[PDB]
Amino acid sequence: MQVESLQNLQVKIRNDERNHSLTKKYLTDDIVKKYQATKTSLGGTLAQCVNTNAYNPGALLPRSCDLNAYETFRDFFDAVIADYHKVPDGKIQHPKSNFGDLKSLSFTDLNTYGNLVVSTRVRLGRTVEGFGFGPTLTKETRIELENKISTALHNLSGEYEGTYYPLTGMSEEDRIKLVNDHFLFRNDDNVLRDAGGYIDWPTGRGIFINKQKNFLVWINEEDHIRVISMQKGGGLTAVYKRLADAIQELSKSLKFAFNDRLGFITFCPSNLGTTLRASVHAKIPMLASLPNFKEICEKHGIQPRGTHGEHTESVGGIYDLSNKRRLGLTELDAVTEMHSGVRALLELEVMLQEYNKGAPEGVMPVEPLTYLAKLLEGASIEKCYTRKYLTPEIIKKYDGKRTTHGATLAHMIRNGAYNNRSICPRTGEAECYSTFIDYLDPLICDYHGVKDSAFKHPAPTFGDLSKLPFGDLDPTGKFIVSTRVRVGRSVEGFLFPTIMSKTDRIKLEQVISGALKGLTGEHAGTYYPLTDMKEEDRKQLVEDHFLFKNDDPVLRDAGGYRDWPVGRGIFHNNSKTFLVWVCEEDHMRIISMQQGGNLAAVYKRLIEGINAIGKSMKFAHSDKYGYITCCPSNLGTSMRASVLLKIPKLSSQPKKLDEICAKYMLQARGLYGEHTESPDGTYDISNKRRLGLTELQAAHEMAEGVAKMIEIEKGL
Numbered sequence: 211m212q213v214e215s216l217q218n219l220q221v222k223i224r225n226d227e228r229n230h231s232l233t234k235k236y237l238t239d240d241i242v243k244k245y246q247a248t249k250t251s252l253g254g255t256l257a258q259c260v261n262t263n264a265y266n267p268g269a270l271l272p273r274s275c276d277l278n279a280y281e282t283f284r285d286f287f288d289a290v291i292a293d294y295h296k297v298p299d300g301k302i303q304h305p306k307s308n309f310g311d312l313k314s315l316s317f318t319d320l321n322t323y324g325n326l327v328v329s330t331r332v333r334l335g336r337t338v339e340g341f342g343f344g345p346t347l348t349k350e351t352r353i354e355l356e357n358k359i360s361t362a363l364h365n366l367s368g369e370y371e372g373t374y375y376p377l378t379g380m381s382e383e384d385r386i387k388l389v390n391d392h393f394l395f396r397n398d399d400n401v402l403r404d405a406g407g408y409i410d411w412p413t414g415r416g417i418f419i420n421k422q423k424n425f426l427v428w429i430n431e432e433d434h435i436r437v438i439s440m441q442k443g444g445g446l447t448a449v450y451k452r453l454a455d456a457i458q459e460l461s462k463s464l465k466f467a468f469n470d471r472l473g474f475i476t477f478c479p480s481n482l483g484t485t486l487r488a489s490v491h492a493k494i495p496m497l498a499s500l501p502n503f504k505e506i507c508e509k510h511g512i513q514p515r516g517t518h519g520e521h522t523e524s525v526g527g528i529y530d531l532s533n534k535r536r537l538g539l540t541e542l543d544a545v546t547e548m549h550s551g552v553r554a555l556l557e558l559e560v561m562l563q564e565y566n567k568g569a570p571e572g573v574m575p576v577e578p579l580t581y582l583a584k585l586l587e588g589a590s591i592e593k594c595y596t597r598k599y600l601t602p603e604i605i606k607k608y609d610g611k612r613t614t615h616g617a618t619l620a621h622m623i624r625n626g627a628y629n630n631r632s633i634c635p636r637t638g639e640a641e642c643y644s645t646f647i648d649y650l651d652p653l654i655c656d657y658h659g660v661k662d663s664a665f666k667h668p669a670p671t672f673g674d675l676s677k678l679p680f681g682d683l684d685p686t687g688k689f690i691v692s693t694r695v696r697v698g699r700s701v702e703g704f705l706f707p708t709i710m711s712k713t714d715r716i717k718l719e720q721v722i723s724g725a726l727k728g729l730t731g732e733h734a735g736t737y738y739p740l741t742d743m744k745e746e747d748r749k750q751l752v753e754d755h756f757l758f759k760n761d762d763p764v765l766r767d768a769g770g771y772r773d774w775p776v777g778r779g780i781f782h783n784n785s786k787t788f789l790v791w792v793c794e795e796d797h798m799r800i801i802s803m804q805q806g807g808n809l810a811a812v813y814k815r816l817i818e819g820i821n822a823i824g825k826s827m828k829f830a831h832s833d834k835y836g837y838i839t840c841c842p843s844n845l846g847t848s849m850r851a852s853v854l855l856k857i858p859k860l861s862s863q864p865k866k867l868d869e870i871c872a873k874y875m876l877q878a879r880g881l882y883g884e885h886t887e888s889p890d891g892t893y894d895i896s897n898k899r900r901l902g903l904t905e906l907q908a909a910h911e912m913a914e915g916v917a918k919m920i921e922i923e924k925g926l
């Protein structure tokens with residue numbers, strides 16, 4: 211196989227902005243210098259290994275010119291393997307082959323759990339010693355390999371009797387039937403092609419199929435052999451045993467390449483070790499719809515794969531589920547993990563289907579309350595309001611309940627269950643605060659530090675915008691970078707961004723963007739739908755502290771990134787002193803900011819903007835809780851006044867900082883908001899409480915708070 215010089219290949223890969231491969235990562239100048247003239251014992255080169263990465267930016271891994279590539283270019287492959295298979299401290303290791311004691315082995319049929327499994331499949335790969343892969347085979351040696359393999363296949367015992375169908379002179383209608391029946395590989399794998407997988411096609415290739423049609427072998431496609439066991443239903447025990455017996459019989463007729471570090475050698479580094487992939491095709495549309503679906507799979511040791519294109523137009527929800535691991539465990543370990551992980555996922559799909567029977571369409575489905583309650587147990591009952599008030603009495607009273615429009619208690623604790631460092635819930639609609647009042651009301655009192663709960667949250671009280679109890683603090687630029695004040699609002703009649711539907715978002719955005727487009731004067735500006743905004747535009751505004759971020763796991767697991775990015779947007783005036791996030795955590799976030807410390811100018815611009823917006827829609831509001839929001843922490847005024855405060859460096863004593871914080875009902879966030887760290891010792895310094903006080907008071911408790919936190923400056 212003739213390819214470009216290794217150094218050309220490295221340039222192409224490196225200058226390709228789209229390439230994010232492990233090849234790119236580890237194909238270093240040192241590596242290229244060390245290996246550029248080196249040949250394997252079968253005549254292969256590192257260039258032949260990485261060729262495909264140069265022409266397919268999407269591929270994550272290299273391939274191998276032949277089985278000796280792993281040893282000959284070890285500095286390169288070990289790095290790639292250690293990373294991909296997540297090997298601890300790069301001590302790559304693989305245990306001796308072990309399928310288990312077949313006569314005593316039994317796994318429950320996977321259709322026990324909701325009867326969702328169309329079919330079950332297990333496959334292995336093997337390399338035969340003394341032969342190269344695509345880059346280093348000749349036409350005649352590939353045919354010799356093919357003959358050696360088919361010969362051993364014909365000598366297989368009774369259950370494995372069948373027919374070998376070479377790919378050469380097989381009709382295009384037989385081939386296309388076999389592929390759709392899930393029996394045969396496809397033709398169109400560009401990664402494989404540019405790795406040399408289709409040289410001299412179709413000679414030396416074929417498929418073996420037994421009479422029963424539940425065991426089959428691919429010769430010289432992606433590996434020397436791919437050995438496959440499969441049938442309808444969820445009978446994994448039978449599928450596994452059939453595979454294991456076949457490969458043990460074949461092991462006596464063929465010498466398979468095996469490595470003490472890497473296990474069985476394969477063409478792609480992804481398949482080293484067991485090479486074993488045990489899979490089901492299962493109907494799991496609700497589990498598949500969850501925000502953290504992939505991570506839930508990963509956590510159970512399972513990789514999900516789509517099946518899009520394998521069915522008619524209206525067939526959905528069918529996924530390939532398999533053990534993610536290959537390397538550093540036995541075959542028995544692998545299929546056991548597959549079986550435990552898939553069972554758990556399938557059971558979770560049954561629980562979701564039961565628990566969300568009858569819920570509104572497009573509304574996020576949720577795990578059962580007692581399931582999420584158990585995950586929440588990894589959170590601290592002293593820091594986490596979400597857990598502290600989720601008592602056994604609460605679960606008993608509220609499990610099974612829905613608001614009028616479908617919100618549950620399970621919904622609002624879900625972000626906490628999956629992000630145990632998070633400390634507040636995220637509600638689904640305004641009606642949550644009455645429906646689930648026994649849980650939310652004492653949490654609300656605790657967080658906001660209500661002292662006399664006999665009284666209403668004050669009516670909206672913004673004060674006289676002409677004579678304010680603060681003015682320009684007027685600093686230098688020594689402590690305060692930028693002054694900012696924001697409020698959240700909800701629109702009556704709409705579910706919150708957590709569980710609202712796509713169609714809801716489209717209608718909400720229309721209401722709000724309409725009002726925003728009509729703002730005049732200092733508040734006149736442009737609305738930017740996230741659907742039309744470029745990725746470097748968006749990231750600039752985010753790093754400029756103007757736009758909300760799109761990768762917060764806590765908001766993601768609460769439902770807030772569903773149907774992304776439909777109905778999300780940023781509005782701002784030309785100066786960017788006034789801004790509105792449409793449908794992030796809340797329906798609205800109305801923001802005023804500028805460089806400097808002039809809180810009064812910032813505050814005034816904010817209040818004027820709120821009133822103008824409020825002409826076109828009714829904000830959700832209660833006597834007890836004031837302006838209602840997604841998170842209970844943002845009730846009342848829903849107001850957060852803040853500056854980014856360079857305190858070099860009271861950070862030095864983060865307890866002199868935490869004391870000076872608890873002492874004002876103020877909160878410390880990172881440079882880029884909550885759940886971020888602070889370089890520079892620069893701190894997001896805001897008033898903590900928003901309920902049980904007016905908008906003037908909230909901003910004054912901040913002013914006094916910062917005025918004082920500053921003053922412990924160069925007395926230091």
Ligand SMILES: Nc1ncnc2c1ncn2[C@@H]1O[C@H](COP(=O)(O)OP(=O)(O)O)[C@@H](O)[C@H]1O
Nearest residue numbers: 329330331333389392393440487489490491530
């Ligand atoms: N559990 C299963 N039941 C039926 N067919 C399957 C199953 N798992 C995989 N397949 C089929 O195998 C073929 C190739 O799948 P692929 O994802 O490349 O798996 P592998 O890498 O193990 O060959 C496709 O037709 C796919 O539908």
Ligand SMILES: Nc1ncnc2c1ncn2[C@@H]1O[C@H](COP(=O)(O)OP(=O)(O)O)[C@@H](O)[C@H]1O
Nearest residue numbers: 692693694696755850852853854881882883884
């Ligand atoms: N005083 C400030 N100056 C500049 N940016 C700020 C200030 N306060 C908050 N931000 C930014 O606003 C964004 C929102 O983050 P977050 O902490 O979630 O605040 P909220 O959601 O209450 O608006 C973040 O990028 C944060 O860095």
Ligand SMILES: N=C(N)NCCS(=O)(=O)O
Nearest residue numbers: 268269270271401478480
């Ligand atoms: N083809 C296999 N075996 N894995 C996919 C890796 S890659 O094509 O993304 O490099």
Ligand SMILES: N=C(N)NCCS(=O)(=O)O
Nearest residue numbers: 631632633634764841843
């Ligand atoms: N409501 C927001 N964004 N944060 C509350 C604090 S936490 O729940 O994210 O820990």
Ligand SMILES: [Mg+2]
Nearest residue numbers: 395396432436
């Ligand atoms: Mg495949």
Ligand SMILES: [Mg+2]
Nearest residue numbers: 758794795883
């Ligand atoms: Mg936020």
